[PDB]
């Protein structure tokens, strides 16, 4: 037993991280087959970042102005292009460590592992959720742009996120691997609003099931509720509305524990209205919303 | 900015994980040079585990009774021996992925990354502290024994932990790579007590510094204190006593923030006595003690 926020093993991704430099700006790129993907703001000076005209900036840059380095070894850049907010640098050498991969645009409420890297060197790994407002709560600094978020299904790496920026609230924003931002953000240094950060109700429920599975059950009350009833309470706390799809998705956990989803909702309702009274659930003193039902099943089942 | 519990990149360790099977018991082993290290209870049936005589059990086992598998490929076992609570299986093939490594016995209060593996297949990665009572709060199930805990310093992997068992409290126990338990535990299925789990005071302080660095400062009060004064309060809450060594270790963080260690102690004292009043610090509603000063510096500095 025990339940922990855990990231996917990062080995397959480590082997794809390179350092990309243009002028005095350095960040990370992702080397897959003969292409290196990186944030287009690698072409900006600190001045440019305030209001960059990327089309105009990129035109002053040739292949040889992009310095790409995997370990101590240079890659030869033989082409460049800009796709939305990412550059693709064609190199003359296919990464011999390229794993099977795809590019995916992840839905809000889903989770992924981030391999924090500094100027091409893997630094550490942790789990994030894509929040309903299309931000993540990460740990990023200068040099960590181009670090990627991914999931692994056996041998397939699904890349879903590349890091670009931080908002005034201290949360993080970035793109899929086609360079399209998650959320309304743009890659320039101006103040930008994410909007109200709502709680991922289905994830809270999953974690409450996790807790029950791992012996924590003090919060199981004698009440039930309905979706409409629970959702009237949800709105009040800026929880996402629960739908039947979410009910269905929790099916396996409901079965495994013998606790109806609406009974757990009633329990969640009393926690929201009455707080925790200084108690903890899976060693947290607030309601955790960054574990998906999959995340919970994967851990509690354990196998593979 | 932002502060996250993050594990070391796990690639170097992934390449050392193998599956060890003896009879119907399967678990993980660590393959370094021509040696595979695994928990000696791989030799037990479910019955034996209640009260195993390992010396007697091991004598019924020959080299060929240990099935060792890295991916789909068998290793040939050419020798076996028992060192404390681990078996060493000599194999005829040096692991070509062996990184530079050492074996270290970690101190209580220090942290490490765990690569959770299931029957030889890496599953995920997360950070643990070795608690003052020499337990860890992990996530482990059958099949995850032999999963290892480590730290990385540039290219050197320091292995410090191998997983063996779970205590009635749901916490975890294991050995160094010489097979010596952390704490008073033994590898048999009987009820065993860890004793009072004290809070790692120096780590709490470091995390409070992390918070200040990352903009959270509502808890900075107008008081100071002394070590003896603070330690009288520490004892009451089962915090570890603060010593000058801990003061010194916090030096870099004290300097970086301009907050004297004893001022932060005074702030910690008021948090202990008055609670959080429903507020959060780095998105937690309790006091976090699983980040070392190093962990905090490493993240906040970021570089390398």
Numbering used by the authors:
A (entry chain A), B (entry chain A): 1 to 304
Passage from the reporting paper:
Mpro is a cysteine protease that mediates the cleavage of viral polyproteins during viral replication and is a high-profile antiviral drug target. The SARS-CoV-2 main protease (Mpro) is the drug target of Pfizer’s oral drug nirmatrelvir. The emergence of SARS-CoV-2 variants with mutations in Mpro raised the alarm of potential drug resistance. The X-ray crystal structures of the representative Mpro mutants S144A, S144L, M165Y, E166Q, H172Y, and Q192T with and/or without GC-376/nirmatrelvir provide a structural explanation for the drug resistance.
S144 is located at the S1 pocket and is part of the oxyanion hole consisting of two additional residues G143 and C145. Four mutants—S144L (183.3-fold lower in kcat/Km), S144P (523.8-fold), S144R (478.3-fold), and S144K (534.0-fold)—had significantly reduced enzymatic activity compared to WT and increased resistance to nirmatrelvir. GC-376 is a veterinary drug candidate for treating cats’ feline infectious peritonitis virus (FIPV) infection. All mutant complex structures including S144L showed the inhibitor and the protein assumed conformations very similar to those of the WT. In the unbound state and, to a lesser extent, the complex structure, the S144L mutation led to a drastically different conformation in the 140–146 loop, as well as neighboring regions to avoid steric clashes caused by the bulky leucine side chain. Importantly, this loop constitutes the oxyanion hole stabilizing the transition state of the enzymatic reaction formed by the main chain amide groups of G143, S144, and C145. Interestingly, in the GC-376 complex structure of S144L as well as Q192T, the thioacetal hydroxide is placed outside the oxyanion hole and hydrogen bonds with H41, unlike most previously determined structures. This suggests that the interactions between the oxyanion hole and the inhibitor thioacetal hydroxide, as well as, by extension, the substrate transition state, are likely weakened in the S144L and Q192T mutants, resulting in an alternate conformation in the inhibitor crystal structure.
